[PDB]
Coordinates of C-alpha atoms in Angstrom, one line a residue:
X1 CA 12.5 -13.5 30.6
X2 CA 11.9 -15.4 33.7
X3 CA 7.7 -15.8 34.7
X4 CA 6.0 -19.0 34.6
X5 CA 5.0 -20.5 31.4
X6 CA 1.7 -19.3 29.5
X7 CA 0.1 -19.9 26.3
X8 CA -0.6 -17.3 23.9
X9 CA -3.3 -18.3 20.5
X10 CA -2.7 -16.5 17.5
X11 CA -5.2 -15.5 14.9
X12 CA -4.2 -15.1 11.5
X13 CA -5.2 -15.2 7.9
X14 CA -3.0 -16.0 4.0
X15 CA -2.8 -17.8 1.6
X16 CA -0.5 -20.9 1.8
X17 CA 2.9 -19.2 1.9
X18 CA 1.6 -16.4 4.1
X19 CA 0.6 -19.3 6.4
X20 CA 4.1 -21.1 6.0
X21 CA 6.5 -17.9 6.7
X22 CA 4.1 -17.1 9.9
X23 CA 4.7 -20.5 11.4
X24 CA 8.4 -20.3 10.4
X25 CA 8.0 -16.9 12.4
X26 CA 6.3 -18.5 15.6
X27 CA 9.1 -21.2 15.3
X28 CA 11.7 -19.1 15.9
X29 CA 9.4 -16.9 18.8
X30 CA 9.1 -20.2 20.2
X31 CA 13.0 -20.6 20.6
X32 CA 13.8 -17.5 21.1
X33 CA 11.3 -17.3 24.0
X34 CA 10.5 -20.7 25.6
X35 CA 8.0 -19.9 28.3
X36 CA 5.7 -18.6 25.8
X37 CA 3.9 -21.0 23.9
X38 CA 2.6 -19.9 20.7
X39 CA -1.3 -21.9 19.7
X40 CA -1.9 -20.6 16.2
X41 CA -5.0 -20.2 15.0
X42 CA -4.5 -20.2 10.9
X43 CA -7.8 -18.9 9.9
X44 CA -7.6 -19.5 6.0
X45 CA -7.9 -17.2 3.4
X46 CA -8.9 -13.4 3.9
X47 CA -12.9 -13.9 4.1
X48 CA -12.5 -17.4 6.3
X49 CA -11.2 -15.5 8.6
X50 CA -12.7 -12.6 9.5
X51 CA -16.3 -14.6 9.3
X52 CA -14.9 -17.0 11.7
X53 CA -13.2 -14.4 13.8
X54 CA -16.6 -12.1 14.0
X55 CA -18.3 -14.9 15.9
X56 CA -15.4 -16.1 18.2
X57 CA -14.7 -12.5 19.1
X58 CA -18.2 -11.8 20.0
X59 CA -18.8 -15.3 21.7
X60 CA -15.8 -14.6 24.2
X61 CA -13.2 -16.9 22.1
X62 CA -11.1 -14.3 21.2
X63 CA -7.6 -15.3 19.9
X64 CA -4.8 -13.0 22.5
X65 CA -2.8 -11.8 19.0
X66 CA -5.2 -11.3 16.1
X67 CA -4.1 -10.4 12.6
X68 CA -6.1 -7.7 11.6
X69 CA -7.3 -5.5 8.5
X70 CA -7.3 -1.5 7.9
X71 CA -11.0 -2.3 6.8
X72 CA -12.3 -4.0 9.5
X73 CA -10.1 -2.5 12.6
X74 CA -12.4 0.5 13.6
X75 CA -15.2 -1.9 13.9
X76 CA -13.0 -4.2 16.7
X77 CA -11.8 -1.0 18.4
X78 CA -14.9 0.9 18.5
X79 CA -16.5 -2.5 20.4
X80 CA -14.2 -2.5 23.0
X81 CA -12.0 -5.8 22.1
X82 CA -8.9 -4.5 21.3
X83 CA -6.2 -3.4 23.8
X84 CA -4.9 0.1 23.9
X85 CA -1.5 -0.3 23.1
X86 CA -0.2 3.5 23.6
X87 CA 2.4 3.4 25.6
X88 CA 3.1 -0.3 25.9
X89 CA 6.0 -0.9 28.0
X90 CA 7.2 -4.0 25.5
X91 CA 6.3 -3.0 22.0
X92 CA 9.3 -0.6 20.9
X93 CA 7.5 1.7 18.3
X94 CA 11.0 3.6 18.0
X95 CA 11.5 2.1 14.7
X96 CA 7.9 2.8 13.1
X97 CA 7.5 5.8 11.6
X98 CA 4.5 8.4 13.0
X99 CA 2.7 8.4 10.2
X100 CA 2.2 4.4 9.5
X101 CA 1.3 4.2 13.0
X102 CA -1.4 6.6 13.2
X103 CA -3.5 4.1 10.9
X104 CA -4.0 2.0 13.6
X105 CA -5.4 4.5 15.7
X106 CA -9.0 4.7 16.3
X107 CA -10.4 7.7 18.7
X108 CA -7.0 8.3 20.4
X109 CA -5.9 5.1 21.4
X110 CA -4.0 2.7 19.5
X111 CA -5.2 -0.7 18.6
X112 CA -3.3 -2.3 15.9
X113 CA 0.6 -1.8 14.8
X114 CA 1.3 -2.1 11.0
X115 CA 3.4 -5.2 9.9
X116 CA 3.9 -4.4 6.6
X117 CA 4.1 -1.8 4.6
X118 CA 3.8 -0.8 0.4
X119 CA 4.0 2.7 -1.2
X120 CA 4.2 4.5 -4.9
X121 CA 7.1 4.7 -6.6
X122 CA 8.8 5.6 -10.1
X123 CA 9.8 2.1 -11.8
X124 CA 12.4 3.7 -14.1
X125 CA 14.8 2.1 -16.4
X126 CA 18.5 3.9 -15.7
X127 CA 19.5 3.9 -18.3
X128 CA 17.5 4.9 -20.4
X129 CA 16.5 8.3 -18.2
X130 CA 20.0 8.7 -17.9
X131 CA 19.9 10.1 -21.6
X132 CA 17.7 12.9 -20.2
X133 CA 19.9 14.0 -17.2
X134 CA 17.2 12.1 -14.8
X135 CA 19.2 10.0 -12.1
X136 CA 16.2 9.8 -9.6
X137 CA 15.5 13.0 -7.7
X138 CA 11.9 13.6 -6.8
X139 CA 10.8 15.9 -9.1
X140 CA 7.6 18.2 -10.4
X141 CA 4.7 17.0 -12.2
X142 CA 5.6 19.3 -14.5
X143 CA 9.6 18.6 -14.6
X144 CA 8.5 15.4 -14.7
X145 CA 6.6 15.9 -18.2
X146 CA 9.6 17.6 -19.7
X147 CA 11.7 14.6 -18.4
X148 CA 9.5 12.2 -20.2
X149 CA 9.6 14.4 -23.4
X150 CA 13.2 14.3 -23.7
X151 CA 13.5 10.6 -22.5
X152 CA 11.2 9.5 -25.5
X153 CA 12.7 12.1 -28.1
X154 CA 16.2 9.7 -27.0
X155 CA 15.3 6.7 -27.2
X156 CA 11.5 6.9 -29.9
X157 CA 9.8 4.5 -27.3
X158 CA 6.6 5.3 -24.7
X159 CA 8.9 7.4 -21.4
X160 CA 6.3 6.1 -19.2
X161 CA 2.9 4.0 -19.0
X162 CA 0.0 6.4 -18.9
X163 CA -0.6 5.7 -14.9
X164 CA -4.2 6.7 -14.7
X165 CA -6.2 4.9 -11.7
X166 CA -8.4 5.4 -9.1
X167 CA -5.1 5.1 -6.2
X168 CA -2.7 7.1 -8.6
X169 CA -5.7 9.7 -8.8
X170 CA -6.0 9.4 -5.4
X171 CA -2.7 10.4 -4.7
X172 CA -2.9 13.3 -7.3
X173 CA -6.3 14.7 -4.9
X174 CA -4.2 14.3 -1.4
X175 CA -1.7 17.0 -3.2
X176 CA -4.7 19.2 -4.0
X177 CA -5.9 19.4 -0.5
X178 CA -8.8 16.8 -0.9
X179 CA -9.1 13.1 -1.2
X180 CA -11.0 9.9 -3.1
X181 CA -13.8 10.5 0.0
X182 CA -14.7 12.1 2.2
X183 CA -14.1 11.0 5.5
X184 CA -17.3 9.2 6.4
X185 CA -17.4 7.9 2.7
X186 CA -21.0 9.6 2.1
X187 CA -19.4 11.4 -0.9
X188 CA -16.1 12.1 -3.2
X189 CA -13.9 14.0 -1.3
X190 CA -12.7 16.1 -4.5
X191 CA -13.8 18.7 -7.2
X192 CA -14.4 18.6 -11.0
X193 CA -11.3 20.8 -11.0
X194 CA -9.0 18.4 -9.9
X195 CA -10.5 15.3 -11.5
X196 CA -10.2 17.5 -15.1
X197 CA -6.5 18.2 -13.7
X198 CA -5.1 15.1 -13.5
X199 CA -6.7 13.7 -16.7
X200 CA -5.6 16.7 -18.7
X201 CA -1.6 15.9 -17.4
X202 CA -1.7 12.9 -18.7
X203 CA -3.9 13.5 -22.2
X204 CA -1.0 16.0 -22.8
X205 CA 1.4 13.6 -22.4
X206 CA -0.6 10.8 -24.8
X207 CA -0.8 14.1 -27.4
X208 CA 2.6 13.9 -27.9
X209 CA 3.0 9.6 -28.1
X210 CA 5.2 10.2 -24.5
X211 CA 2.6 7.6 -22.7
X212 CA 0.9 4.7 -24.6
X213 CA -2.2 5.4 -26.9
X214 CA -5.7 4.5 -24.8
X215 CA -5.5 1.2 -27.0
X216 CA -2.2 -0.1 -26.1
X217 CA -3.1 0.6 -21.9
X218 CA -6.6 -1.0 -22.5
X219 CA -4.5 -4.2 -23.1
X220 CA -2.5 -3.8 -19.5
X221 CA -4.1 -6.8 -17.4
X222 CA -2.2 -6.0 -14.4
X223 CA 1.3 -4.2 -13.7
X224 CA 4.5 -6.8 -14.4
X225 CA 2.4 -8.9 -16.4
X226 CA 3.4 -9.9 -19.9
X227 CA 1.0 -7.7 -21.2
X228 CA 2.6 -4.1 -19.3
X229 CA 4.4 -2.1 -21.8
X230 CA 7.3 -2.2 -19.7
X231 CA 7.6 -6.0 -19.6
X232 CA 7.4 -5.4 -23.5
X233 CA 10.2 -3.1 -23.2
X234 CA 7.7 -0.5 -25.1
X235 CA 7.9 2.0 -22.0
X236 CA 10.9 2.6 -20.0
X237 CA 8.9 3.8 -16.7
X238 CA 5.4 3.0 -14.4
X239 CA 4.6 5.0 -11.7
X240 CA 3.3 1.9 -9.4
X241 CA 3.6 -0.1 -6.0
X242 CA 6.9 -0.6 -4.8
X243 CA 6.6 -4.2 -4.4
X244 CA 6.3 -4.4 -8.3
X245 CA 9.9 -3.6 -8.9
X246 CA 11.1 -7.6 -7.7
X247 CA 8.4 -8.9 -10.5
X248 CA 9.3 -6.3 -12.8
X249 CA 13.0 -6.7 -12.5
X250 CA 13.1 -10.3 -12.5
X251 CA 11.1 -9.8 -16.6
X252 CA 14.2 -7.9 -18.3
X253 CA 17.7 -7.8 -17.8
X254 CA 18.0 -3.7 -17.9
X255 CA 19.2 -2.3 -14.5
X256 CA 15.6 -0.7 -12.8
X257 CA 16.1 1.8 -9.9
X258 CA 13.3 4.5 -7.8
X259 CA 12.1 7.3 -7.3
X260 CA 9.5 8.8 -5.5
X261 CA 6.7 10.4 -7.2
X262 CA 6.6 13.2 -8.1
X263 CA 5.0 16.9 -6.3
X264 CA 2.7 19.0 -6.9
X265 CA 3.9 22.7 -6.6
X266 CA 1.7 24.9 -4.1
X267 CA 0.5 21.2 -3.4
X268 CA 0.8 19.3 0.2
X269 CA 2.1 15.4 0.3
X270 CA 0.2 13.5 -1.5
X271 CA 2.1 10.1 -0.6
X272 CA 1.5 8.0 2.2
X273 CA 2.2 4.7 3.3
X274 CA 0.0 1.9 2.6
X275 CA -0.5 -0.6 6.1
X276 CA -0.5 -4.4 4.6
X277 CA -2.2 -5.5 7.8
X278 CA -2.2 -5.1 11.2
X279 CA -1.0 -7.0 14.8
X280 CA -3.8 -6.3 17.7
X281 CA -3.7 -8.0 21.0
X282 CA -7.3 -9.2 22.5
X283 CA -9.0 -5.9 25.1
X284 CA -9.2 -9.0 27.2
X285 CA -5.9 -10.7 27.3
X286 CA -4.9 -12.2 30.5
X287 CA -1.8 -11.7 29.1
X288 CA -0.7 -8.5 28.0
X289 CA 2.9 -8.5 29.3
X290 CA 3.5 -11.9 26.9
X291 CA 1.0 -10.6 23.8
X292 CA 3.3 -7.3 23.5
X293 CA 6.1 -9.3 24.0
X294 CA 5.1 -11.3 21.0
X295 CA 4.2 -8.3 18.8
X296 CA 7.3 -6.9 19.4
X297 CA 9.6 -9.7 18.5
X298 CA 7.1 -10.2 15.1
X299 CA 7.9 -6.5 14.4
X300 CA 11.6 -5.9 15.4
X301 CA 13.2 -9.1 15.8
X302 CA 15.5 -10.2 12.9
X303 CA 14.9 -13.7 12.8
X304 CA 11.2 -12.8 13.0
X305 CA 12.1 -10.4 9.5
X306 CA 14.1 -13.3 7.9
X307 CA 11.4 -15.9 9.0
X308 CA 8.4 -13.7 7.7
X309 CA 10.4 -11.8 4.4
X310 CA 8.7 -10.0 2.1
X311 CA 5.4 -12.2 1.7
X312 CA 3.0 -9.0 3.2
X313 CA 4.9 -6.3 2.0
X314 CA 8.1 -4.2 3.1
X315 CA 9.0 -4.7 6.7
X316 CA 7.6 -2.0 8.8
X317 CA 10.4 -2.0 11.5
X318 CA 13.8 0.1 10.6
X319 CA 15.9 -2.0 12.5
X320 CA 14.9 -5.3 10.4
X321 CA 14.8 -3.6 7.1
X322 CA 19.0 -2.6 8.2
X323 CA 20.3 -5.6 9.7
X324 CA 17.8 -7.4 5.8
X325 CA 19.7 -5.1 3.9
X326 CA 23.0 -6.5 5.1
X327 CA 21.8 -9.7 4.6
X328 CA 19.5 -11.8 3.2
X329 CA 18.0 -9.4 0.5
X330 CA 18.5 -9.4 -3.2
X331 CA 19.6 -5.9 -5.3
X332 CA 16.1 -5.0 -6.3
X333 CA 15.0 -5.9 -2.8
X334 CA 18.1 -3.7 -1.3
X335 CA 16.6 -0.7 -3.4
X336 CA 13.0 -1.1 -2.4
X337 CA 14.2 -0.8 0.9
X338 CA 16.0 2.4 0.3
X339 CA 13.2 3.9 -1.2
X340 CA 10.9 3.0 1.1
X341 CA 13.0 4.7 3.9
X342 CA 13.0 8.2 1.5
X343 CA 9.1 7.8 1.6
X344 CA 9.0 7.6 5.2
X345 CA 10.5 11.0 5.8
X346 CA 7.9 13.0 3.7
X347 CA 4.8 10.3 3.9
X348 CA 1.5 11.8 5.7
X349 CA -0.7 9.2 7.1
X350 CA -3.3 7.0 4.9
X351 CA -6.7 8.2 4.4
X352 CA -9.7 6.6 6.2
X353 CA -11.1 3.3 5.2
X354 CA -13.3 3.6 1.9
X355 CA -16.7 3.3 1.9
X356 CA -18.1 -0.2 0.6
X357 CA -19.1 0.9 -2.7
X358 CA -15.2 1.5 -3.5
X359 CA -14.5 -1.6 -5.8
X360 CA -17.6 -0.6 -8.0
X361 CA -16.5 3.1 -8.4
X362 CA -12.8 1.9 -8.9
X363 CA -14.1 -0.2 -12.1
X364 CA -16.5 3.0 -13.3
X365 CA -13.3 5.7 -12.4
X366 CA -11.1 3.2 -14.5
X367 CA -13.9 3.0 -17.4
X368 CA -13.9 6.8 -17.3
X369 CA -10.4 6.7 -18.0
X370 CA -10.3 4.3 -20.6
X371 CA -13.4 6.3 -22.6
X372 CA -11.0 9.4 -22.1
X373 CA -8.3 7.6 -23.6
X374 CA -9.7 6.5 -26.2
X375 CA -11.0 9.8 -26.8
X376 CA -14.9 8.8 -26.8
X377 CA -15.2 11.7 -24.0
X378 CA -13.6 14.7 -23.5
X379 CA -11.8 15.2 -19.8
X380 CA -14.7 17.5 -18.3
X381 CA -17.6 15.1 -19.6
X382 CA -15.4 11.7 -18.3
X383 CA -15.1 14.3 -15.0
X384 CA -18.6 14.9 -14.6
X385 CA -20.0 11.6 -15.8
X386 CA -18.2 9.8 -13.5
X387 CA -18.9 12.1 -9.9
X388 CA -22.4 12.4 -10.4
X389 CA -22.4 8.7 -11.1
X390 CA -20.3 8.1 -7.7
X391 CA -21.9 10.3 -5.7
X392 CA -25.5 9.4 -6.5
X393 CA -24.0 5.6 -5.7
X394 CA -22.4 6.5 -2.1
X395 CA -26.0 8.8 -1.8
X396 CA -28.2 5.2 -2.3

């Protein structure tokens, strides 16, 4: 490109190493494009940032790129200081799948483009499944059960880690139709019915010792952590986040390979793809032509994808994850780029933001699970308990 020189500032938030790859990132922009200056803006952690940013913004200080959040980008659009970037001549959205874009619209228009991206998979030991016939197909919830069954009959140890949450339940409700909320977050988007479900499909499984007992999964701090049954090499399977499988792998020497999870017969697609965060460009810009320019070398360029690497989550762009996968990715990096492009093709878009109250009723929908487990209620009584609980909460 060939126009005079401008200066473009850049609003972002991370943790130290998040701030590190970024400015690598800008570096090479900076080379690659030298009649665009870059002024970054490093906002600090998460919090810092948006506080900060809510008063700039409104006070007219607005940075032209802003990193932005799933939670906070309706509130940006809806105000008018976003730009519209349907249709932008210089943002090539060829290599973004439909679905992970339409979480950055807001009432038609489109105001932030994903720049990362994280999804559920099957964390399976190989070789270990590969005593049951299993070599990775997306399968059944209820092939998936047998699988399990004839995985632990093989081998006397846990199949999988009894993968009850508030997401992986959330999953199992987009497959019956319904979801966590409902789409203004005034109440659970779901029935008894379901809820009952889900918990009963995996009580069967703890019946016969396929999953671990309520007391062993009450000592699970997080996923990969020394305390996961699967770092223990207790459970050969955990139906998680992608981005587990580097941790994971790097824990035990057994080979670890994907799948996607599994389907619900009669059921529509309960996956989706999960936006780490989002590029917007400033309604107000006085440079648009440059600002796209930038978003588009953060999202397709290669030394952009090298610079940035997996610090937010998966790249977004197809383009990057190729040329990454030919270089500059390890083997359980390679495979969590494969799977990722097998989610793409069936992955419907993300449901709405949550309502506020969601990190409370995550903790009481986990305690639910854990009093099922532990058999202290039965699945219709954890079921009921916990809705009228949530719903009188997102009522208040």
């Amino acid at each position: 490109d060939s126009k005079p020189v401008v200066t473009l500032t850049f609003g972002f938030w991370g943790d130290a190493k998040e701030e590190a790859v970024t400015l690598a990132a800008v570096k090479a922009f900076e080379k690659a494009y030298p009649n665009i200056h870059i002024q970054t803006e490093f906002g600090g952690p998460f919090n810092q940032y948006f506080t900060k940013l809510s008063t700039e913004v409104a006070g007219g200080n607005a940075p032209d790129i802003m990193q932005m959040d799933y939670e906070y980008i309706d509130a940006y659009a809806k105000e008018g200081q976003l730009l519209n970037l349907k249709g932008a001549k210089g943002i090539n959205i060829s290599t973004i799948s439909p679905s992970v874009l339409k979480s950055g619209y807001i009432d038609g228009g489109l105001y932030g483009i994903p720049n990362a991206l994280n999804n559920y998979a099957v964390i399976y030991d190989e070789a270990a499944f590969a005593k049951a016939g299993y070599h990775g197909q997306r399968v059944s919830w209820q092939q998936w059960a047998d699988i399990l069954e004839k995985v632990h009959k093989a081998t006397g140890k846990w199949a999988e880690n009894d993968d009850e949450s508030w997401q992986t339940f959330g999953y199992w409700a987009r497959q019956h139709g319904q979801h966590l909320y409902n789409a203004s977050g005034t109440k659970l988007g779901f029935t008894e019915s379901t809820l009952v479900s889900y918990l009963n499909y995996w009580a069967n499984l703890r019946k016969e010792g396929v999953v671990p007992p309520g007391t062993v999964t009450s000592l699970i701090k997080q996923t990969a952590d020394p305390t996961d049954p699967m770092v223990q090499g207790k459970s050969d399977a955990e139906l998680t986040w992608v981005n587990y499988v580097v941790s994971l792998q790097s824990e035990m020497t057994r080979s670890l390979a994907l799948a996607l999870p599994p389907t619900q017969p009669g059921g529509e697609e309960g996956l989706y793809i999960k936006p780490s965060q989002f590029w917007s460009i400033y309604s107000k810009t006085k440079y648009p032509q440059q600002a796209e320019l930038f978003v588009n070398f953060l999202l397709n360029n290669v030394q952009a994808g090298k610079a940035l690497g997996l610090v937010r989550g998966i790249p977004v762009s197809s383009s990057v994850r190729t040329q990454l996968m030919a270089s500059g990715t390890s083997a359980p990096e390679k495979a969590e780029f494969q799977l990722v492009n097998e989610a793409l093709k069936v992955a419907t878009p993300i449901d709405p933001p949550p309502p506020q109250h969601d990190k409370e009723i995550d903790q009481d929908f986990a305690n639910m699970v854990q009093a099922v487990q532990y058999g202290k209620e039965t699945p219709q009584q954890g079921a009921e308990q916990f809705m009228q609980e949530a719903n009188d909460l997102l009522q208040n």
